[PDB]
Design a protein around this ligand. Sequence first.
Ligand code: HEM
Length: 289
Amino acid sequence: LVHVASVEKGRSYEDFQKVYNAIALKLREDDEYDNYIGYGPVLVRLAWHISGTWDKHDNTGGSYGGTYRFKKEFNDPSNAGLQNGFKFLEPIHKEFPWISSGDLFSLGGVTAVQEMQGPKIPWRCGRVDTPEDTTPDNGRLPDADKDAGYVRTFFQRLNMNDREVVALMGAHALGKTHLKNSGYEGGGANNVFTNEFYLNLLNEDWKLEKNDANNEQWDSKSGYMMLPTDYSLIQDPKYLSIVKEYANDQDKFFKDFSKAFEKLLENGITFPKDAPSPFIFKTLEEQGL
Ligand code: HEM
């Protein structure tokens, strides 16, 4: 099964920079969402969930088809809460009806990472909407109550190795969990992209507690939390080494995250040899906007 990137007709870097800018300006404007976290974190999660349905074995799922717009995927219990990100992106799509849904969802994640002071994430256009019958079934996104061996095996389906997994998980510096969405009680939250997920794993005094949904999570007195799958990264000796690396090298974390996140958002897509090079968008701050 082959999905060939097809550039939206006549569009070029400047068109997509305009879409980036509209997303970034709305991120600035709609600042009260989720107790003043803003929409950044949920847009990153949305980009990951529309990509994380991919299966390397048959090239089903993945970001290309934009299938999150269909009820089966929109209503996946694993996607609870992401409707907020979809609703955020609705006026963007109305202003720019030419961008494909997969391009918009993935660009939302890139824009959020960069605007939250994260690394530059190169981004490629050309995802094409596919029909409702191409929507992947529920159950392809990962469980949080599991251990390191589960995480490692899960991410093999996405063609990610240990370093790529530990880098991607650093996005859990962002935002919070919400009991009503996922059965996990949120702790201290931020909307600035840093390597503090790794520092928190290594430096906090973690206690294994039960939350009000009767699920186990790791909590600290500082008010931070970790899922069992997060904490597995310091229980497994191979993951632990990489956690320590990223805790001690911000730039390395940024560079590895940027590569893994672009890869995640591009899995499943065949780019023609003459496709445009990846775009690196300027932030609002870099543009003086
Ligand atoms: C084993 C892998 C993973 C598991 C089990 C997992 C699970 C979860 C859960 C349960 C939540 C809370 C949802 C809610 O209650 O609102 C969450 C939030 C989040 N996840 Fe993950 N996740 C994983 C990997 C990732 C990856 C790879 C990324 C992106 C690179 C990511 C980005 C985020 C973000 C940014 C949030 C915060 C959303 C918000 O504040 O609304 N996650 N994740």
